[PDB]
């Protein structure tokens, strides 16, 4: 109810507005890469399941 | 502690919720077939096991 209370409220307001978040294209990056990894291995997986009911790899 | 890092964790959470498992029926019926393999050839021996107290195969 002061003029310098809301002043004090604007500055404090600026000063927490101002934190550095985290990186989060890295973040994201990292989950992208572990689907990739994830994807491969599955495939090796199956490309060895289908070499047991032929003795062939596709194609 | 920030209502941006729990959105990034969600959106990460459903990224890798979404990973595609490998295919599992044809992984279970590689193993049913490997049976039924095995079982032929186990009749077989018995039937050639028969053929030698007595000289002639089942019925």
Known sequence: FTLIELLIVVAII???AAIAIPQFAAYRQKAFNSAAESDLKNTKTNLESYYSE???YPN
């Open 14 to 16: 600026g000063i927490l």
């Open 54 to 56: 032929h003795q062939f």
